[PDB]
Write a protein that binds this DNA or RNA. Sequence first.
DNA 1: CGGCATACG
DNA 2: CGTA
DNA 3: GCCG
Length: 325
Amino acid sequence: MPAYACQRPTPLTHHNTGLSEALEILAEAAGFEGSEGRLLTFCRAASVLKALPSPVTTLSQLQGLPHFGEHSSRVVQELLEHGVCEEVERVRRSERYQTMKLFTQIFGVGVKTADRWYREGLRTLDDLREQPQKLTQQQKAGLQHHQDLSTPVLRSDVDALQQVVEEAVGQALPGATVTLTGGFRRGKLQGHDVDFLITHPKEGQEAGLLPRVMCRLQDQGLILYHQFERSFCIFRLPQPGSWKAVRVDLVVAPVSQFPFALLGWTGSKLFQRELRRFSRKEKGLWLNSHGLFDPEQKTFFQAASEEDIFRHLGLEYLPPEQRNA
DNA sequence: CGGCATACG
DNA sequence: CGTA
DNA sequence: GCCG
Ligand SMILES: [Cl-]
Ligand SMILES: [Cl-]
Ligand code: NA
Ligand code: NA
């Protein structure tokens, strides 16, 4: 089992679901405490289990696996022996974890803001509502729409949304295309947001596109909230006899950069962090959603496809369905 | 020990 | 600071 | 927390 998540296929569903979920609780809790190193380790150990071809039933199966040291191994050991890990359960029922999870789930609220509110004694969404002077307009929208945004988006919803985005994009710039990215491109049947990448086949025609797209969607009454080339919005999505708020991200890239933007925005988040870490540390190349830079030659690799990018990094190609690290 | 992805709004 |  |  190779050390980086980008070196192994990771399917969306797998054979170690409970073990990985437990490790991810500890990762999440480390993040709430600002411990990014520990968050990464627990994320990586969880991902290794997702990549295994069968269930871990015995502690000896962890031998030789990367990212399993004393701590992650003890978590697995306790789950195998008793069905539960005392540390994980202590985190789950803790006021700190529950409140930081609740607050960071709000659109517009990150760990730092959540922690500040926690320290001020705030605990519930109604606590935040009672103090609107404490909120940015983005947070106010996140809080008003929190219930809808907590509901899973279905792939059927995604397809209806794509047609609407395509219509606006087509008027903004005929010939421009819309590609579904994010978790849905990785095969998810449900999700909490929808990501689209927009380009045009004629290099440079994409300049200034996103404001034209957003103005048109706003004119159609589809935008509940928006605040350039990336837009993090809340859209009005039809439902039987009503509608609901959905998080939608829109990103524009020049066609020259499209494979890099597609790769970046397809995720998963851990997959992309691992891939960029691999590129820099193992290959000495610097990867982002715009390109892949050789800092010695001072040149950019001109990729025509995601397959090109994997080849240039010396990695076996993984389709989006196997990037669920 | 140092390092942990890398951008844009 | 937030977002991915 | 773990790797190199
Ligand atoms: Cl840490
Ligand atoms: Cl980027
Ligand atoms: Na080990
Ligand atoms: Na948030």
